[PDB]
C-alpha cells in the first residue's frame, strides 16, 4: 500500500497486488478519511 | 545546572558574558561570568565597566571558581581581590600545573579541602573504569635519521607522524569501530590532525574550524553510526561540550602536561555505559619509540598514576600484519610521507580617496 | 455571542474575532562532505 | 449522527417552515442536507435563477440563516471566478434564532401592554390620535363631548382595550405554534455546541453532484492581516531455537564487552608493530506396520 503524506496536496492510495501485478488507484478528499 | 537542580528564580540569575549583560535587580542572587572578563585589563566597554562596578561595590557571600588550577595565572589570581567574597570555593578536576604555583591557592582560596578516591568511585560506578595504556611505536629507519638531524621544535612534529603511528592509530580506529565505540583521537599538532583525519576519512575539530561546523560534527558523532570516530585537537582538551567516547587515542601531546593528560581522560569517564557489568573504558597513548615523546608521555602520566591508573605497555598489536589496509606500508609511501613532512619546514574631498 | 451573556441566557457561540483577537558558513572538512548528516532534532 | 447535530437541524427547518415561504424553506433544506453549497451547486440543484435567490439570500442572511464564504479558488483551466459558499453557522444561527423569538415575545408583550392603555380618541377629520389624559383638557362647557383642537369636531372613541384579549388570544395563538421551538433548545441549552467554521463544515458535506466547479479544498494565503500490530503463532519448538538466537546476541553483548587480546595479557615478548540411521528409522517404521497389523499525477509517498 502506497500512501501519500499530509504535507503533499493530492491524497490517494495506491494498491499493489501479487501474481504482472494488478496496480489500482484510490483518491480522496479528505485527510482524515485516508 | 543551577536552574535545574535547585529553586532558583531565573530573575535571580545574572550572566556577565559578551552577548549578556544585565544583570538581576533584586537585593541578592546568582551571577555567573568568565576569568577573562573579571580579570580583563584592557580598556572594557561602558556595560561591562558598570556591571564591574556592580560586581565590586556589592560584598558577596560566596565565589565558585570552576577549574581553579586556572587561578594561579597572571591576573587570574586577582579574581579574588576584585572581588570581595566571605567564602571562596575552588572546584576543580585537575590540581596540578607544571609550575609551582599550584602550591600557591592555599594562599589564594584556601586549603586543599577534599580529595576524590578516583579508584574508589570507578568501583562504585561512579566514574568509568578506564583501561590506560601506552602504545609504543617504533620509529622507521628513514624517518629516525631525519629526527636525530634536526632542532627540537621540528622534532615535534617529526615523531609524530612516523608510520607505525599511523598503522596503529588505523588498526585500533577499526578494531574499537568494529566493537561499537565512540573514539576520540587527540593530537595538539593540527598539521597532523588534519593529515591523520585525511590519511583515515574522518573529521577533524581545531580551533580554526566553524562553530556551526563543529557543532554539526558533534550532532553526527553523537547520533549518526557511521561516524564513530571524531579528531579533535586542544579544543577537546579545554571545556567544550562533547558526546560521550568509550575510546580515547592520543596521537601528540602539549610536552609534558599533566593536566591535559588528565582533562582528556575526564572526558572518557563520564559514559553512559558505566552501569553495564563488565564495561571498560580505553586510554591510548600512541607514542614514539627512542623520542622525546616517552619522556613528556611519563611525565603525563605521573600524575594518573598518583590516583592509580597503571598504564600498561603495548608494544605488540594482534592484527597489524592481517589488516586489510595498511597507512604508509610500502617504503616509497613513507618516503614520500618524509619528504612531505620536510617540506612543511570636507563631505566632498572624501570620494577621491 | 456575549450580549446574551449580558442577559443572563447561555450562548452557544465562542466570542467571534470581533470583540478581541490578535545562514551558511564555510566547511573545513571538505574530505568527507556527503557523509555527514543535517542534525536540527536530537 | 450526533444527537444535537440533529436538533439543530429541525429546528433550523421548523423556523423556515413556519415564518418564510416555500423557496426560502428549499435554500435552507439545501443548505442542511449539502452541509457545504456553493452558489452554482445551489442554482444546480434547485434550478433557480440568480435574481429569484436575490431576496431569499438577502433575507437568510439578514437573520443568519446562511454565512457565506468568499473563498476563491484556482482551478487547472484558470478561468476563476469569485464563487460564494453558502453553509450554516450553527451557534450563530441558534442564537440568532433565539434572539429573533425572544425580541418577539417582547414585541408581543409590549404591544399587549399598549393595548391595556385605556381607548382614547380619534379624530376621523384630521386622522389625529389624542390620549384620554389631553381629551379632558378639550372637552366642551357643556361637559358632555371632546372637541378637536383643530377641526373642533366631536372625537370618537378608539378601540385600545377592545382587542388586548384578542392580542393575548394572538399571545397563546403564537405559543403552542412556538412550542415546539422552545422545546428544542432545552436540550440545546443543557448541552455543548461546537462553534462550526467553514473549515469544520468540510467534515460532513454531500456531494450535490459528481462535476463540481466549486472546489472544496481550502487553500491558505500569505500577507492577508484581516503503531501497527503484529502477531506470532508459534509452535513453541522453534521458539527455544529463537531464544538460542538470543544467546547468539548475548555471544555479541561478549565480544562488544570483550578485553583486547594486548590488554589482557603481556604483549613485551612478541615482535614489534610495523608494516545411517534412515534405513534403521524405516525398518522400525515397517516394523511398527507389522506390529499393527498382527495385534489388530504523481507526488510524494509516505508508507504508513
Ligand atoms: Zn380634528
Redesign the pocket.
Known sequence: LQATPASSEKMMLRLIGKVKPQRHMFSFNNRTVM | QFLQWCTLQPENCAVFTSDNKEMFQTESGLVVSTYSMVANTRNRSHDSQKVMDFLTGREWGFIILDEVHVVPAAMFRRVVSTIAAHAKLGLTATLVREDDKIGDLNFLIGPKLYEANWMELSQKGHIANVQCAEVWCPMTAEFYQEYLRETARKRMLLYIMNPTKFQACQFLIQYHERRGDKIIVFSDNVYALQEYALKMGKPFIYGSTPQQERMNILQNFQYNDQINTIFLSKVGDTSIDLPEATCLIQISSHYGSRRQEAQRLGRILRAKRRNDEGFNAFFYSLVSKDTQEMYYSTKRQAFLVDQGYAFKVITHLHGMENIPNLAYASPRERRELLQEVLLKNHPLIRKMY | PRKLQDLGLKPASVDPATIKRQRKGKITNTHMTGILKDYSHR | DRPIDDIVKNLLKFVVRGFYGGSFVLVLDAILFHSVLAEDDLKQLLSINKTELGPLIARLRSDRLISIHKQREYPPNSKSVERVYYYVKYPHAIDAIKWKVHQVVQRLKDDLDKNSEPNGYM?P??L?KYTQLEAVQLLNFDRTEFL?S??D?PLVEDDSGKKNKEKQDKLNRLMDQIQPIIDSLKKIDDSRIEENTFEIALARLIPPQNQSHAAYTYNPKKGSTMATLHINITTASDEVAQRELQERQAEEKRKQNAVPEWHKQSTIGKTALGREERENEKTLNDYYAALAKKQALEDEFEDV
Open positions: 379624530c377629520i384630521c389625529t378637536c383643530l377641526c369636531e
